[PDB]
């Protein structure tokens, strides 16, 4: 057997200033993702890029400022595709699209893998409730929908009643945090959610951060890993084609190291790469840099090394 990878485009957003994020899937593709995954020796299955259609009204307005029901229903279609990809025996890679798609991927991942854990790499905790933030900011709430302890703080919206909370507070760990709303800070502290801010990373170093993240998640038993990786986790100089750029993020090397440690476990079952928005780039070069970096995270998460040695080499040719 060789390691099998399924790839899904989920070009999901709520429009407004972040409409361009629906072009992230195609941009990551055009930076040569499937070729890189093929060179690794992965058996590949492409579901292509899913339609994102506003319900109940598919007009220009509802496509540029998207009602939340549309985001709820799109995530429900996504969950089933991820659960198909996983039931078929593929580690499932979903290309964003905004971080609201984590509602689809983690729910769908959790169906056949209920004991999964989550490594959330992001500048943001994305844990606001529909009551702590606005109606067009579902990209900043995915985790409130999935977390089990938060059920009584989370109202029932049209398009989101399908969702079964599938993560406990000890089963998610955050890496990269540097932009956290006050209620998000409250939730983290109150419900004991473990997190490594950029300050923690500066103090401990990323090597120790990954050692502690695994101690918390897989310290006692082996469990399927879901990597939810926001490109905005990287410093804005490395990944500028993103919608909420925050100065002081991961360097390229910290980000590859995360991805190498995740690979080295042998337990990566699902991966999101979100928030690549090529229209917010000032130049083609900013667009391509952000898209090349996303490809590097996915490749590295599935066994690309920096020192070579992934593919087996037998002997050297002799002169003649």
């Amino acid at each position, epitope marked *: 057997m060789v390691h099998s990878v399924a790839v899904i485009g989920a*070009p999901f957003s709520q*429009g*407004q*200033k972040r*409409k*361009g994020v*629906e*072009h992230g*899937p*195609a941009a990551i593709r055009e930076a040569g993702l499937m070729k890189r995954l093929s060179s690794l020796g992965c058996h590949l299955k492409d579901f292509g*890029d899913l*339609s*994102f259609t506003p319900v109940p*009204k598919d*007009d*220009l*307005y509802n*496509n*540029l*400022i998207v009602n939340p029901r549309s985001v709820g229903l799109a995530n429900q279609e996504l969950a089933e595709v991820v659960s198909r990809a996983v039931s078929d025996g593929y580690s499932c890679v979903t290309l964003g699209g905004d971080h609201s798609l984590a509602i689809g991927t983690i729910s769908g991942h959790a169906r056949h893998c209920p004991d999964l854990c989550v490594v959330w790499v992001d500048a943001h905790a994305d844990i606001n409730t529909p009551l702590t933030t606005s109606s067009g900011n579902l990209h900043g709430q995915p985790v409130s929908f999935l977390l089990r302890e938060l059920q009584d703080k989370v109202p029932q919206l049209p398009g989101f009643s399908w969702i079964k909370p599938c993560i406990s507070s000890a089963s998610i760990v955050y890496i990269g945090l540097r932009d956290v709303d006050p209620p998000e800070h409250f939730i983290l502290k109150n419900y004991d959610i473990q997190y490594f801010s950029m300050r923690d990373i500066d103090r401990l170093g990323i090597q120790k951060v990954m050692e502690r993240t695994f101690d918390l998640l897989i310290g006692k038993r082996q469990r399927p890993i879901h990597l939810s990786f926001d490109i905005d986790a990287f410093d804005p100089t490395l990944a500028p084609a993103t919608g909420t750029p925050v100065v002081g993020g991961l360097t390229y090397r910290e980000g590859m190291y995360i991805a190498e440690e995740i690979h080295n476990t042998g337990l990566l079952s699902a991966l999101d790469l979100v928030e690549v928005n*090529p*229209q917010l*780039a000032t130049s*083609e070069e900013e*667009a391509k840099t952000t898209a090349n970096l996303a490809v590097d995270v996915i490749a590295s998460s599935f066994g690309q090394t920096r020192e070579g040695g992934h593919i087996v080499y037998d002997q050297l040719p002799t002169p003649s």
Partner: antibody
Amino acid sequence: EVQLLESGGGLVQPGGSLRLSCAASGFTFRYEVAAWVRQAPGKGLEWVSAISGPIPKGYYADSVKGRFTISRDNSKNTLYLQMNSLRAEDTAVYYCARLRADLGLYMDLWGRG
Amino acid sequence: QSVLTQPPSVSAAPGQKVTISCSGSSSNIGNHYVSWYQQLPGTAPKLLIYDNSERTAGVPDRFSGSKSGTSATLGITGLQTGDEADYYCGTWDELTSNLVFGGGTKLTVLG
């Protein structure tokens, strides 16, 4: 550092066909939502067509649906409007515009017409 | 077009002030953000105002947008002769599923 230039307009007979262009420069139109708006001489502005998302998808006014087709060539960074079964009332100057959203919708860049 | 109502013309002297009303329904201005476009003779419309009162880069504070109920206003103070344009309001209509516009207002600075 950013502009739009239309061409292809002129004189055509009733029941005729005609294709307008709109080349962007200084930005990548591809990742942007684009629109056509028109002005019958000495009158207001009518919205005609819009093209959004990565598929992409086209939206039309009922006064043109089934006669006009909006498209784009990402290679030539150009926006098109194909106009079939044309009528005297279709007589107008035609602008291509960039359509964006924040709280609401707005057209922040217009071509020469 | 002309879902939205504007006056056909307004005038005042240089340095003086004027407002332009934009009148709609519950299904357009009532529930959607108004934008204001300036068109100088023989030129392309330019976005002045969006989301009711957000000025674009370069547009000065003497160009002011406002909105109440189902109506919107464009205030211009300090009138210069370079203000002599046709001005249009615009928004979304959730009745016809159209971007809609007013019929325009010809501004004259009295010389």
